[PDB]
Amino acid sequence: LGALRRRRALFEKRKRLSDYALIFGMFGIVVMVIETELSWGAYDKASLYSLALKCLISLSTIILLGLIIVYHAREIQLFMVDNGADDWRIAMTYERIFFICLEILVCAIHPIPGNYTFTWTARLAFSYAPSTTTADVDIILSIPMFLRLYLIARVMLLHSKLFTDASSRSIGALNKINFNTRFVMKTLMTICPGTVLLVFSISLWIIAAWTVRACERYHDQQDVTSNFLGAMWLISITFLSIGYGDMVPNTYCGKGVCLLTGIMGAGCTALVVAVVARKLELTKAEKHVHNFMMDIQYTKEMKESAARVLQEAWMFYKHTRRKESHAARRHQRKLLAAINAFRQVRLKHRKLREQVNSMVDISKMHMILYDLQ
Amino acid sequence: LGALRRRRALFEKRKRLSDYALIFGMFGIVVMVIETELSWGAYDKASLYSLALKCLISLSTIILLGLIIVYHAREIQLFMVDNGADDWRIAMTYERIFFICLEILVCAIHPIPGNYTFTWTARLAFSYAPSTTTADVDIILSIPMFLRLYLIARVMLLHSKLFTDASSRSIGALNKINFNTRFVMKTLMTICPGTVLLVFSISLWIIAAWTVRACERYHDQQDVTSNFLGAMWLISITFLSIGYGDMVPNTYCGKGVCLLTGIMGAGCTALVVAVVARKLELTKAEKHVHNFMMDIQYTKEMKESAARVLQEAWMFYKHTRRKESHAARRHQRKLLAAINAFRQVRLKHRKLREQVNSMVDISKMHMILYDLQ
Amino acid sequence: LGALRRRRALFEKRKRLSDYALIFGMFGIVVMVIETELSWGAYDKASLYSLALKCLISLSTIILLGLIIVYHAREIQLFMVDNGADDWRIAMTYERIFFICLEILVCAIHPIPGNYTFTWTARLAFSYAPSTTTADVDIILSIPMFLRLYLIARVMLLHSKLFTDASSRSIGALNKINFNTRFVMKTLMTICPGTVLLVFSISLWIIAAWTVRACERYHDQQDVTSNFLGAMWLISITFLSIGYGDMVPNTYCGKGVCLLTGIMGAGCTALVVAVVARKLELTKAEKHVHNFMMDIQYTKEMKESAARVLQEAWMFYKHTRRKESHAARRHQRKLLAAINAFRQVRLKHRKLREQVNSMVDISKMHMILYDLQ
Amino acid sequence: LGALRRRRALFEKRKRLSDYALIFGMFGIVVMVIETELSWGAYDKASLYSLALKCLISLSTIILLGLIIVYHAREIQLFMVDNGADDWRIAMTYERIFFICLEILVCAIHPIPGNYTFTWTARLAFSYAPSTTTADVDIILSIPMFLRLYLIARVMLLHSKLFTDASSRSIGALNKINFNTRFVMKTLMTICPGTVLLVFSISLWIIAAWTVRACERYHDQQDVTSNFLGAMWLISITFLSIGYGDMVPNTYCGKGVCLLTGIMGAGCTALVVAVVARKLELTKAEKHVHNFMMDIQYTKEMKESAARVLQEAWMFYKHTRRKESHAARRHQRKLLAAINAFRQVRLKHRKLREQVNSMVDISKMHMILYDLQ
Amino acid sequence: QLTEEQIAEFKEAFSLFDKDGDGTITTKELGTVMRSLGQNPTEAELQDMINEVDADGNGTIDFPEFLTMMARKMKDTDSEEEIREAFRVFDKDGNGYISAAELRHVMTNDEEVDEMIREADIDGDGQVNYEEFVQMMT
Amino acid sequence: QLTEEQIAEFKEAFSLFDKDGDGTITTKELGTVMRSLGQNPTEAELQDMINEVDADGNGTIDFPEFLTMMARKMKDTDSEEEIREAFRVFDKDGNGYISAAELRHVMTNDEEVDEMIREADIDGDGQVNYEEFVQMMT
Amino acid sequence: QLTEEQIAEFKEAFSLFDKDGDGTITTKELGTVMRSLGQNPTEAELQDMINEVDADGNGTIDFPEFLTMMARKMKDTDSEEEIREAFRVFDKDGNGYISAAELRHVMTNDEEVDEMIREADIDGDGQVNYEEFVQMMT
Amino acid sequence: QLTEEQIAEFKEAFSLFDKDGDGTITTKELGTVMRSLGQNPTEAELQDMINEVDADGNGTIDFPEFLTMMARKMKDTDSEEEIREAFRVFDKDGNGYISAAELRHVMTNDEEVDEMIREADIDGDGQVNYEEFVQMMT
Ligand SMILES: [Ca+2]
Ligand SMILES: [Ca+2]
Ligand SMILES: [Ca+2]
Ligand SMILES: [Ca+2]
């Protein structure tokens, strides 16, 4: 019982540290976007506004890396509590150390204060003409700052109710269920699959469009792919795999982003269609009402269809005996059509009874077994 | 019983008002299309024909907004009858007021009489050259007039039989079914899914093609996307996500319409394929006939395949004993092939019996339970 | 019994007439293709070779229309035999007369002998430049000759075994099955769905490629879409909805053919994927063997995984008691990893038992019910 | 029992010969890639480095063809052992001889030492301008060397455990299962479908990109499709059927490779989506835990939703009796909304019980039948 | 009479319906054939549908009766079955005799129907039977 | 009173629920209609739901009672059913009488609830019943 | 004799078929193994398929008999099984003896078949058995 | 001791497992909870899994025992269960005592295993039990 109190205390600290890691992780991204946009026209990289704003990203990265280090120090202590270990070294595996260093490397990439430049040469689309420009070195460091969005998944898991509830843990234990980040993903895709796919698509739309515009503003002098509204159209048409049109990226950064959008859009659209297809499908209760009303409709149609069979047959017989030829021939054509129409509604009614019996098959089985008891 | 008479009376008024709202809603759209086409070449915006035709749209919008106001005044009275309220204010919620104002705003957008112009600058496709033209202000008001098509869905729901039939209401009540606009959509996609998708695709084809041509006639001087027949090809290829070719829109209005066509076509084609796939599938009754005739075919094939096994075996034995070598070797190769062919038809017959037993599984279960009774 | 002999006699005549209608229907198409290709470079439309070859199409159309008239005269007589009518006029309905005239109109379109020309103006792709040429009038009549391929479906139905077999008719009658052209289509998509889709795709590939090249040889002076091998690439990429590249048609005939290819390819590829998906799925018999061998594999894996649990646990205990710290710590890390690996194989084994019981559910139900008997 | 020892001995030789055929098959491909890359800029076809490297491919082809001949000589001996034949000619069928010659023809295509050239004329994309170059004859022989990858499938089958295990053979024999190359493919797509599709896609990505660059380096003077990184983007966008952009191949070799990528990518992406869709689906055990926790959540929601019904109802009653009008009206609007919210959670709870009973249907059937025993 | 091939194929169908080969289709054979086709026919319906074409009334279907049934069922649409079904759905009470009240009722979905009754009651029994219905239909 | 068309359609619904046409909906007919809709209603629940609208208590639903039930069920949301369900879920013990302990318990998800009890106990029986609950709701 | 690894793997298969480890495959063990594979073998078919390779006739399959069965079943196609199935489908009556009438019948799907009968009837019993059929096949 | 919120949530879980609210988890309640989760536990397995954490042996699970079980099951992986499963799979005979022959057998998938046996047999009964196995594991 002692480790139960300690485990909850360490989980609360982990949840608190993951929240502050997202606060400083997203703050650095926001300041990076502000600084990237303003450093183009508002000021230059040699201004004190660029030094001040890039010192905000650098300062927030120091705090963010401190929260990542402390968070993993809490996971070491939680490992010792769960596994009954007293030495921290027993938790240090090759997979754990690699992922601790991977998170630090991902979260340590940011625009360093100071003006450094490199030569960027790209081949223009549709003209195949080289374009050499002196680009800042902070553009190759601003794009990887979007990899800090993995902290969103960490916050989602740590804030999930079934991840720590004593009722879901007990019920899941009886069924041998593993409560990990993959189980939370599967439950999200069953509760709200449309919301997850819609939020992901919109978030990817803005991020990919900004990355395309940010990379293709150095080599675009005609406001084609450097325009934010022209980059949102490019990302959307690539998402739907329509094409590129005239919005073919001039840089391999924009070509890679468009490739990533095409891969994500190949599966996202297919999953969205599946969600809509199962959302337009009548439930079991609604299918029984639809079949009940269809049966009443078909019974009424069979009464009027057979009434037309006799109505045309009597008129055909009356005209034939009354020495009428053209009228009798016309009502024999109508009698044949009435017989065919009566047969058609009789067959579509028979198909409905087959469908009704197919769905009501195992419920009738239960009733029989109850009677045998 | 008193509220039963009043509820039917108020529903008849609502159905009657929704019909006249579609008459004046579609009339304004039709006159808008006529006026837009003729104001290009037949006359100019300073003509008395433009004033007369734009006064028809304005007059029809006044009547349409009056029918929307009265229709929602009937929904207030129906709310009071259903919920047993005597004060109209109890029906006024935030969601209701927002949607009442939303419908008025949507239905009040139309080309105002009078000549007003604005400067429209667009970047030409494939050349990235600016094109500044003095466009009329009635083009940004004509396109939103297509949002009045929501009255079609209102008319479809209010004219639906199960929405008001006393038999469907009683049967649905026992099964706790909600009769709303979503239930009508689901029943339409089960009764006639092909007709709904075909009508929607054709209606979107004409409307999107006209919107693309109407927006891209100011900046197209080469009759590429300004041609109606060249805009129908652009909409169709974007619908199928083939591409754009040389028909890349010069305006963001035509790019937005093509984006909307791509989104709708991503799901419409997938739903159409599902409809065709379930339409080419043999029913349960037709599968039993196909399996019955396949079983007879396989039994006849096994008789001829085993007859070839013995026919080649006897010839092989005869030639071997008759001091023949090349002939015996040839008929041993045929005997091995006959044995393999006999085995193949025997295995494909065995697979058919497995399929027959798999489908006839629960029907045999019912027969056994009936016997136990 | 008398009408049984007459019905078989009339069906044999109908099958014989449908075969000769395909012989002359395809002969006119073949001569049209030969004449179209040779009239471009080999000779001109004023040559006696064009008159001789176009008189072959015209003569074959006279014979083809005679076979269509006689075939429908046999269907009138078969209608009278089946429906017990003695007057041919009783068979003449509005739907029948419309389809008789539709077939005649379709089969009467061919290049008339004689040189007539019309002015063909098209807008070149990617340059939007007009191109006026004096085209022959036989190109707008050669393309509709491909509509005679509906006789292939007529021959397929009339040559089908279950359409006339006295065994399939009797079995189908008991199950109320309708033996029409749609039932034959559904049985073809269940027996050989891959062959039907492959033959259709290849046949459409050659026909659409030739139609694109034939229409776009008048306005193509650079051998782009007028090349047969460059038109096969255009048809295939549009079939897969990849795009157009530089192969955008200069004519609305080639744009319409590419649109038709895109529509057919949207569904053909989806159906092909479904066929392959159900072809890579293990059958019920093969799944039981796979599960049986997986169960033996998991049982052997659990023996070695638990043996590692005890092997590392004993080494950890031995080193701990032997006053060893670094070695004991290392083998405690291995013991924890061995316990996790043992748990993983234990869980994946448990999932296999769940899958085995899920598939073997109704077969066990049958055994219990047999015992109760 | 004697043939059991011989069959295992011949199978070990076949497995050993298939391994060495892959060693020399892949070695010739690797040397071909090295020689093709270096013959462009490092040296010329008249150098002694080209003669030395092309003599390595030629020498490895002699050894590879010797291993193919010997491997098929072992299959002849295994045929005689299995079928009880004493003469090798009985194994020689038309299908076997054709495939023996097909493998030799495929594996004998390689760059012959010596400098031979041919005139290669291609039409440039987007400009339709002819480009005549004197190309080496070893480029039309280097590409077919990638057809030696069929030996990978032979090695995979011969190294498979269930292909020769005496336990899988006995279990499969009882179930009439055929252990061929198609059964191994189906088991791979059920065990690791994601790994098979990922490895195939990556392997095709590198091979198709190199083939496109190798073919389109003679007619590309602007480093568009001749660039390896620009050819990987072209292959990927064609794989996803996005489009071509400006990367339209100038040669029919690169157009054919892009066509092959489009066909493979049409099905590979659809299969990948199906794998992901069935990977995000909750298992039967995980669905029972999710439904159990949802039921507890809905029961708690119904307690708070009905408590709001009474809380608002009492406040409405209190204000009405207390001579308050505006407050009573406001709490009657809240009472109606609380009743609607209580009904909504009651209906979504009822849907959950329906889903719970639908999945727990046949398990309850088993329990009843056990009781009857 | 029919040709050799038609007779052979009709005999093949008859032997498909005749498992034991005794030359007559017992109701058990028809029942097992129908059950093999996924249907669940009761004994009453089985007997009712086996005496529809049983001309001699012996209780079994010989080859001539099967040939007559096939001649009736080879066409796409059989008028006798549709007329019988129309008469059945007309007969709400199910006694086999459609009363004048039912005749009036089936039209609301006066003098004309009275004339129909007068000209359909060939035997003058005061009602309409199946034979009168098929006489009026033809 | 209702018009002719409304009366006709309500009679059509009643005859849908009344197979034998005797003019009253026996619990067997309601049970078979519900079973035809995929539901599995027990006899106890069937009787409980058939006496909800049974005004005269004869055990069967005549046309006026069916008309009253339809007037109750024609609207999208019926307040009586929701108030009844709220009272049911309040009654944890299931005896039909919600005690003060349950009233206190359902709020934790003191003086105010005591005032609610005081003003809801119209008959002064020391507890709250369904009639008091619906009186407080309205 | 077989090597060590082959003997070990064949013993592994035998122990897979031999749950109790007594050294003989009782028909119950074969039945439960087949039922674990989704099949439903009757006792008659189980006994018939267990005596196909039972050389000594003791009613159980020991290791040498299982080894012989595996030698028969390790190849992709076994000629003995196919010849047996051909003989079975030839025998319409199912008595184990294919009569001359059946031999004539199976060819229509005169002197040659008579010569086949003459050269196949090794024992001169007036008919053809399974041993004569396999002698003719080889 | 645990805080108020943890105690409340553990009591909520206990009441989820305790339908009648008597304060003890009878094997019937555990069985019905497991059956509600799609499992089919037999009475023997139910009793075996209910006495794993039953410290006092009274046959029911009170709140302290449920708290101990939750402390055991709150972590992602429980070492006691895995060690128990390893001991079970080691015990082929199922008698609860792993013999030296089984210890030798489980390694082939001599002196070292003999030393393991010598150092694991704490009580010197000539064999290894579950308590010795868990002592060696820790
Ligand atoms: Ca009657
Ligand atoms: Ca109470
Ligand atoms: Ca015989
Ligand atoms: Ca033991």
Author numbering:
A (entry chain B), B (entry chain C), C (entry chain D), D (entry chain A): 118 to 490
E (entry chain F), F (entry chain E), G (entry chain G), H (entry chain H): 4 to 112, 119 to 147
Task: Provide the publication's sentences verbatim.
Small-conductance calcium-activated potassium (KCa2.x, or SK1, 2, and 3) channels are activated by increased intracellular Ca2+ to induce potassium efflux and regulate membrane potential. To enable high-resolution cryo-EM studies of human SK2, we designed a chimera (SK2–4) that contains the transmembrane and extracellular domains of human SK2 and intracellular domains of human SK4. SK2–4/CaM forms a non-domain swapped tetramer with four CaM molecules bound, similar to the previously reported SK4/CaM structure (Lee and MacKinnon, 2018). The CaM C-lobe is constitutively bound to the HA and HB helices, and upon an increase in intracellular Ca2+, the CaM N-lobe binds to a unique S4–S5 linker, inducing a conformational change in the S6 helices to open the potassium pore and activate the channel.
SK2–4 was co-expressed with CaM and purified from mammalian cells in the presence of Ca2+. The cryo-EM structure was determined to a final resolution of 3.1 Å with most regions of the structure well-defined by density apart from the C-terminal HC helical bundle. In the presence of Ca2+, the C-lobe of each CaM is bound to the HA and HB helices and the N-lobe is bound to a short helix in the S4–S5 linker, S45A, on the neighboring subunit. The measured SK2–4 pore radius (3.8 Å) indicates that the S6 helices are in an open conformation in the presence of Ca2+. In contrast, the S3–S4 linker of SK2–4 is well-defined by density in both the Ca2+-bound and Ca2+-free structures and forms a two-stranded anti-parallel β-turn (residues Gly231–Asp253) that extends over the S5 and S6 helices. Arg240, Phe243, and Tyr245 within this loop form direct interactions with residues at the C-terminus of the selectivity filter. In this position, the four Phe243 residues form edge-to-face interactions that create a hydrophobic constriction at the extracellular opening of the pore with a radius of 1.8 Å, which is expected to prohibit efflux of hydrated K+ ions measuring 6 Å in diameter. Therefore, even though the intracellular gate at Val390 is open in the SK2–4/CaM Ca2+-bound structure, the observed conformation is expected to be non-conductive. In addition, the backbone carbonyls of Gly360 and Tyr361, which typically form the extracellular K+ coordination sites one and two, are rotated away from the center of the selectivity filter and the ion conduction path. As a result, only the two intracellular K+ coordination sites, three and four, are intact and occupied by K+.
